[PDB]
Amino acid sequence: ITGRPEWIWLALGTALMGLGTLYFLVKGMGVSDPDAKKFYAITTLVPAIAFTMYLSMLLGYGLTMVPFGGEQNPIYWARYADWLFTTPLLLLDLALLVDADQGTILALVGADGIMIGTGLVGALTKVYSYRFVWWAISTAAMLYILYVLFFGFTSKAESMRPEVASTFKVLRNVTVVLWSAYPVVWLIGSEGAGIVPLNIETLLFMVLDVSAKVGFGLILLRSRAIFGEAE
Amino acid sequence: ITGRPEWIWLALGTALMGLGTLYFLVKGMGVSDPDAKKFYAITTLVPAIAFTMYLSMLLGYGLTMVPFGGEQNPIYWARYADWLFTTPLLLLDLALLVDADQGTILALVGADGIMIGTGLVGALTKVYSYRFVWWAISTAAMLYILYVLFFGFTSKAESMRPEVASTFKVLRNVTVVLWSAYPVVWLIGSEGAGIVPLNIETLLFMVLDVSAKVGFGLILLRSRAIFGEAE
Amino acid sequence: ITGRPEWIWLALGTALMGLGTLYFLVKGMGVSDPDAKKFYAITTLVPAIAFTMYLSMLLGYGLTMVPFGGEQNPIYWARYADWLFTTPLLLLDLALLVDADQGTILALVGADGIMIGTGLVGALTKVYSYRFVWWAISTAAMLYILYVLFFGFTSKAESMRPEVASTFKVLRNVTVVLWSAYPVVWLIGSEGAGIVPLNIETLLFMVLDVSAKVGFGLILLRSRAIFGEAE
Ligand SMILES: CC(C)CCC[C@@H](C)CCC[C@@H](C)CCC[C@@H](C)CCOC[C@@H](CO)OCC[C@H](C)CCC[C@H](C)CCC[C@H](C)CCCC(C)C
Numbered sequence: 001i002t003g004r005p006e007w008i009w010l011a012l013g014t015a016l017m018g019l020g021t022l023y024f025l026v027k028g029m030g031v032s033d034p035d036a037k038k039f040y041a042i043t044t045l046v047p048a049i050a051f052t053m054y055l056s057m058l059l060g061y062g063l064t065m066v067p068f069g070g071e072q073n074p075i076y077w078a079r080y081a082d083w084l085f086t087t088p089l090l091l092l093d094l095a096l097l098v099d100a101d102q103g104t105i106l107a108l109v110g111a112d113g114i115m116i117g118t119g120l121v122g123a124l125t126k127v128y129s130y131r132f133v134w135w136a137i138s139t140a141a142m143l144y145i146l147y148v149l150f151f152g153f154t155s156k157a158e159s160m161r162p163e164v165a166s167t168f169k170v171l172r173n174v175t176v177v178l179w180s181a182y183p184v185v186w187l188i189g190s191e192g193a194g195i196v197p198l199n200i201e202t203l204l205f206m207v208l209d210v211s212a213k214v215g216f217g218l219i220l221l222r223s224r225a226i227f228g229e230a231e
Numbered sequence: 232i233t234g235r236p237e238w239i240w241l242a243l244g245t246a247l248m249g250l251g252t253l254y255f256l257v258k259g260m261g262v263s264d265p266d267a268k269k270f271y272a273i274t275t276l277v278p279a280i281a282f283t284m285y286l287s288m289l290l291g292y293g294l295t296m297v298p299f300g301g302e303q304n305p306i307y308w309a310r311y312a313d314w315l316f317t318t319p320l321l322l323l324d325l326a327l328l329v330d331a332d333q334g335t336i337l338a339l340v341g342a343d344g345i346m347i348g349t350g351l352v353g354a355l356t357k358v359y360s361y362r363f364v365w366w367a368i369s370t371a372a373m374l375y376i377l378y379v380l381f382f383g384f385t386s387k388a389e390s391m392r393p394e395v396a397s398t399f400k401v402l403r404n405v406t407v408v409l410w411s412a413y414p415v416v417w418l419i420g421s422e423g424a425g426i427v428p429l430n431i432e433t434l435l436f437m438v439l440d441v442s443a444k445v446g447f448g449l450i451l452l453r454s455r456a457i458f459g460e461a462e
Numbered sequence: 463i464t465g466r467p468e469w470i471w472l473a474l475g476t477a478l479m480g481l482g483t484l485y486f487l488v489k490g491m492g493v494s495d496p497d498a499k500k501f502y503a504i505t506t507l508v509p510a511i512a513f514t515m516y517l518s519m520l521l522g523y524g525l526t527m528v529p530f531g532g533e534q535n536p537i538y539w540a541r542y543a544d545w546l547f548t549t550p551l552l553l554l555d556l557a558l559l560v561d562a563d564q565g566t567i568l569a570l571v572g573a574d575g576i577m578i579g580t581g582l583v584g585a586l587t588k589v590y591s592y593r594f595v596w597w598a599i600s601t602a603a604m605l606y607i608l609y610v611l612f613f614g615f616t617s618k619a620e621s622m623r624p625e626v627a628s629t630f631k632v633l634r635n636v637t638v639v640l641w642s643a644y645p646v647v648w649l650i651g652s653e654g655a656g657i658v659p660l661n662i663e664t665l666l667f668m669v670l671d672v673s674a675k676v677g678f679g680l681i682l683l684r685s686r687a688i689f690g691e692a693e
Pocket residue numbers: 084109110113114117118120121124280283294295308311312313315316351
C-alpha cells in the first residue's frame with residue numbers, strides 16, 4: 001500500500017468519509033419527520049459509497065494501468081464508480097429541496113450519467129488525442145447541469161419557503177464552484193496532459209470530494225429546510 | 232478509423248443522433264408544462280445516449296474481439312450499453328402516454344432489462360451453439376413486452392384522451408415493427424449465423440436505431456398528447 | 463458442463479427458478495387490482511433474473527478464476543449480478559407491504575447495494591487477508607438492513623391491516639433467517655476460508671436462493687395482503 005506516494009491522501013480520504021458517514025448516521029437517529037428522513041438517507045449514503053471506493057483505491061483494487069503516450073499510466077477507475085452513484089444523489093438533494101418537477105430531475109440525472117460515463121470512457125481510452133474528445137463531451141454535460149441549477153432551480157427556490165431558498169442558494173453556490181474544479185484537475189492531471197503529478201492530483205480530488213460530500217452534507221443537515229413546516 | 236468498412240455507417244449514425252439530440256434540446260426550450268417536460272426529458276436523453284455510444288464505436292472503444300467458430304469475431308458491445316438505457320426510456324415514453332400503473336411499468340422495464348442483458352451475454356458467449364440459447368431467452372422477453380404493449384396498453388389508451396389514444400397507437404405500431412427487426416438482424420448477422428456481413432449489419436442497425444429513436448421522437452414531440460389538457 | 467461436480471446443483475437451481483417464474487407468471491394473469499399487480503411484477507421478476515444467472519453459471523459464462531492463496535480459485539461472479547437486482551426487489555416487496563416512507567426505502571436499497579457491491583469486490587480481491595475486510599463491511603451493511611426490518615418496519619406493520627401485519631411478520635422472519643446464512647456460507651466456502659468445498663457450497667446457496675425467492679414468493683402471493691381493501 002505504502003509503495004504508492006499518493007497512499008497518504010487515499011488513507012486520509014477513507015478516514016474522513018468513514019467519519020462523515022458515522023456522524024450523519026448518528027445524527028439522523030433522532031429523526032421521524034418523513035421529509036427529513038429523505039434528506040438524511042440521501043446524504044448519509046453519499047459518503048458511505050465514497051468510503052468504500054476510497055478504500056478500494058487504498059488497497060489497490062480500484063486502480064488499473066492504461067497504455068497511452070507510450071507509457072503504462074496508473075488510472076484510478078474507482079472514482080467513476082463512486083461518482084456514478086454519488087453525483088446523482090447530490091443532485092437529488094438539491095432537486096428535492098426546491099420540489100423540482102419530475103422531468104427536470106430526469107434531465108439532471110440523465111445528463112449527470114452522461115457526464116460520468118463519458119469521463120470514464122475518456123479515462124480508459126488508449127488513443128491519447130481521443131481522451132480529450134470525451135473530456136469535452138463530459139464537460140458539455142456538466143455545463144448543462146450547471147445551467148439548470150441556475151436558470152431552472154434558483155427561480156424555483158424563490159417561490160418556496162425562505163429557509164429552503166436560502167439553504168438552496170448556499171448549496172447551489174458550493175456545488176457550482178466545487179464541481180467545476182473536477183474537469184480542470186482531470187485535464188492537467190495524470191488522466192489528461194500530465195502536468196500535475198498523480199500524488200498532487202490525488203490530494204486535490206480528496207479535498208474536493210470531502211468538501212463536496214461531507215462539507216455539503218454538514219450545511220444541508222443543519223438546516224431547518226429539510227423539515228416539513230410543522231407546528 | 233477508416234480501416235473498418237463499416238465506419239461510414241457508424242459516422243452517419245453518430246451525426247444523425249447528434250443532430251437529433253440538438254433538435255430536441257432546442258425544441259424543448261420553450262416548454263413550461265410539467266407533463267410535456269417529462270416527455271422532452273425522456274425523449275432528448277435517448278439520442279444523446281445513443282450519440283455517445285455510436286461515437287465510442289466509431290473511435291473503436293466500443294468494439295471487442297470474441298473467439299467463436301475458430302475465429303476472432305468483431306463484436307460491438309457498446310450497442311448493449313446504449314440499449315440498456317435507451318430501450319427502457321422508450322418504453323417509459325409509451326407507458327406515461329397511457330398513464331400505465333406502476334406494476335405494469337416495472338414489468339416492462341424488468342423484462343426489457345432481461346432482454347438486453349441476455350442479448351449481451353449471447354453476444355459475448357464463446358460456445359457457438361449457446362449463443363442461440365441466449366438469443367431465444369432474449370426473444371421471449373421481447374415477446375412479453377410486445378404482448379403487454381398490445382393487450383395491456385392499447386385498451387388502456389382507448390379510455391384516455393383521443394389525442395393520446397391516436398398518438399399511442401401510431402407509436403405502438405412503429406415500436407412493434409422496428410423492434411421486431413433487431414433479433415432478426417442479430418441472428419443473421421455477425422453475432423449469429425454470419426450470413427450478412429458486418430458492414431451491412433451495421434447499416435441495418437443504424438437505420439433501425441435512427442428510426443426507433445429520432446423517428447419515434449419526431450412523432451411524439453409534435454403531438455399535443457404530451458401536454459396536459461389546459462385552457 | 464458436467465466437468466464440474468457442482469453442475470448438478472446449478473442445473474437444479476436453474477430448473478426450480480424457471481418453474482417458479484412460470485408459476486408466478488401464470489398465477490398473475492388473472493389480476494387487475496393495481497396494488498396486487500405491483501407485488502406480482504416485483505415477485506415474478508426475482509426468479510426470472512435468478513433463472514438467467516443460474517443458467518449462465520451452468521453454461522460456464524458466469525465463472526471466473528481468481529488468484530489467491532497461490533491457487534486459481536473458481537469464483538462464480540454471476541451470483542452478485544443476480545443479487546444486485548433481486549435483493550433490492552425482495553426488500554421492495556417488504557417495504558411496499560408496510561407502506562414504508564421513501565427515505566426508508568432509499569436507505570434500504572442503498573445499504574443493500576453497498577452490501578452486494580462490497581461482497582463482489584471481496585470475491586474478486588487477490589490479496590487474501592483483504593477479502594475478509596470487504597466481507598466485514600458487507601456484513602455491517604447487512605446488519606443495518608436487518609435492524610431496519612425489525613426496528614423501523616415491524617412497528618409500522620402493526621398500525622396497518624391485520625392481514626398485512628401478519629404476512630409482513632412471517633416474511634420478515636423468513637428473510638432475516640435466510641439472509642443471515644449467506645455471509646456464513648461465503649466465509650467458510652471457496653470465497654473465504656475454503657473449509658467447505660465448492661460443490662457443497664453451491665448446494666447450500668441453491669437451497670437458500672430457492673427458499674428466499676420462490677419460497678418467499680409463494681407465501682406473499684397467496685396472501686390477501688397484496689390486494690387493496692375492496693368490497
Ligand atoms: C439514464 C442515465 C443512466 C444514462 C447513462 C449515460 C451513459 C449511457 C453514458 C455512457 C455509459 C457507458 C460509457 C458505460 C461504459 C462502461 C464501460 C466503460 C465498462 C468498462 O468496459 C470498457 C472496456 C474496457 O475499457 O471493456 C472491454 C470490453 C468488454 C467485453 C465490455 C463488455 C461489457 C460492457 C461494459 C457491458 C455494458 C454494460 C453497461 C455499460 C453498464 C453501465 C456501467 C456504468 C459505467 C454506466
